[PDB]
A paper describes a structure:
Of these, the MT-based motor, Kinesin-5 plays a key role, being essential for the assembly of bipolar spindles in most eukaryotic cells and driving or constraining the rate of spindle elongation. Purified, native Kinesin-5 is a ‘slow’, plus-end-directed, bipolar, homotetrameric motor capable of using pairs of N-terminal motor domains at opposite ends of a central rod to crosslink MTs into bundles. Structure-function analysis of the Drosophila melanogaster Kinesin-5, KLP61F, identified a central bipolar assembly (BASS) domain within the coiled-coil rod that is critical for this motor’s bipolar organization and whose deletion results in disassembled, mostly monomeric, Kinesin-5. Instead of the expected antiparallel arrangement of two side-by-side parallel coiled-coils proposed previously, we find that the BASS domain has a novel four-helix bundle structure, which very likely has important implications for its mechanism of action within the spindle.
Numbering used by the authors:
A (entry chain B), B (entry chain B): 648 to 802
C (entry chain A), D (entry chain A): 640 to 802
The structure:
Amino acid sequence: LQVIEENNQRHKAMLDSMQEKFATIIDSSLQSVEEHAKQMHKKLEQLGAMSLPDAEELQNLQEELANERALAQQEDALLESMMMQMEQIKNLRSKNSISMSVHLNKMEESRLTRNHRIDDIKSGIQDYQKLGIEASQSAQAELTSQMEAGMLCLD
Amino acid sequence: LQVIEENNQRHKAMLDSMQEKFATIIDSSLQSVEEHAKQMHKKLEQLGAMSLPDAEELQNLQEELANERALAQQEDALLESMMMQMEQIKNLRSKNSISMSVHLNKMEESRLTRNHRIDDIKSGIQDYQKLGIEASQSAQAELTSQMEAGMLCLD
Amino acid sequence: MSKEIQTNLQVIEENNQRHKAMLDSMQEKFATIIDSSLQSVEEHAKQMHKKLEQLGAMSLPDAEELQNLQEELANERALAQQEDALLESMMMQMEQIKNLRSKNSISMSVHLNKMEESRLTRNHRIDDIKSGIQDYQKLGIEASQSAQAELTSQMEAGMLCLD
Amino acid sequence: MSKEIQTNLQVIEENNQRHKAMLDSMQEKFATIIDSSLQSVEEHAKQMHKKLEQLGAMSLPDAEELQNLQEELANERALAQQEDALLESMMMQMEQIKNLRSKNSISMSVHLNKMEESRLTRNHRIDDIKSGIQDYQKLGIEASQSAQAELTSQMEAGMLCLD
């Protein structure tokens, strides 16, 4: 009669043995979510950590790329510097060389003059010789003219 | 008689008219020598005068030939100077460039690592998915096992 | 009292039916939940896979850049060699010109020395000619006075008897 | 007194002969002197001509030197041109290398900028994935508590008559 409760008690026992199997499955799925979130955010943090070292390299490459441009800078200035001096020397050389071509032609000009002056001293001596021969002949004349006039009488 | 002196007087007159023609010829030949010596030593002095100007030119050429050697001197020093600096720049460039080849390979080394780390997060999610499917099947089981046990009597 | 039992039977059958209606009611509801937590999982998996592909897809361009960068480094190294060879080949031409220029300056100093020596010799040979004149006009003066002797001698001596 | 004249004749013939002997004597002697002063002249002329030839003979070597000197000046001018051309052609190669090097450094800065921009973007896409998780586990927590409601709800409600 009253043991109709006994059917209820096993039926009610069927829920509390069920609510437990059910709660434990939901709780083992929520636990499975917050677990995955742990494992990932871990591997994400380590991956995001790579960024600072990658930015280091980029900054160095950036710096090394600057050093390069400053070395190219130094080179242009050098070249232009040592070219300008090379040019100034080139002109001094030139100036010098034009000066030498002048003194050489002034010595060729002198060599030719020495010649006209040497030649005319030869000519001057030959003149003296010529006048010495003419003198000799003249004296041989005045001499024999005194001898011719050493006569007396007659005829 | 005594006029035999008259022959002597004309004879003596023949000498003094002769000594004169003769002295005058010697004296006109000595005069002709010391005259030539005058005309020559004149042209010799002017010729010998050329020597100082010729020595001037030689001294200048000597000087200009010295300037040249000092310009060649300046050039060697210049070249060697601007070469040495060119060399130092060459090395700095090199050093820089070797440094860049290092940072580039450290970024390729990082790119490959990023990949292994990206791939395994994909693999980690597929794992989570796989475990989520296995969980779902497991729960469908424990569920229907509670339903199967909702029977009574008989059999 | 035979009906007194059919009363208990109809309420024990009622309680069982009432109990089964909710027994089905929660099971269907629960199978909805586990089938919803799976969809919530597979959706997030799709959600993440989309972003992980988009992120992993950056690898090729990053590699493009490094490759382009790496070869541009080679360009520089080429330019270095070229510059090197240019300066070296300039250094060597400059060496030879230097020598030639040197050799040439010596040859000029030698010709200059020759002309200074030639100038010197030319002066002493001019000196000799100046000397040759003062020698000559000396013998010239001495010849005339020596002849005026022998002239005026035999004039003075030729007048009358002399010994 | 006929002989007194032959006395004067023999002494006037004597005086004339004596006078002629010396007349020849000085003329021969004088023709020796004028013939000696000419030899003294022609000898000095030979004497000078020898020295003037030896002196004038220096002209050719002096000219040799100037010519050798003049062409050595041309050697220098050649070397100048060569050096000029060498430096000019070096200046121009150096100009091009400079440009290439320049152009190259820009291309590298561009690839670097790209990678700094690529790095930035890659971080924010990583940020989103971190965000996507905290979104997910939020919806995860909220889903569980919402289901524990509907679970414990119909357990509590499914015991006996409820409305």
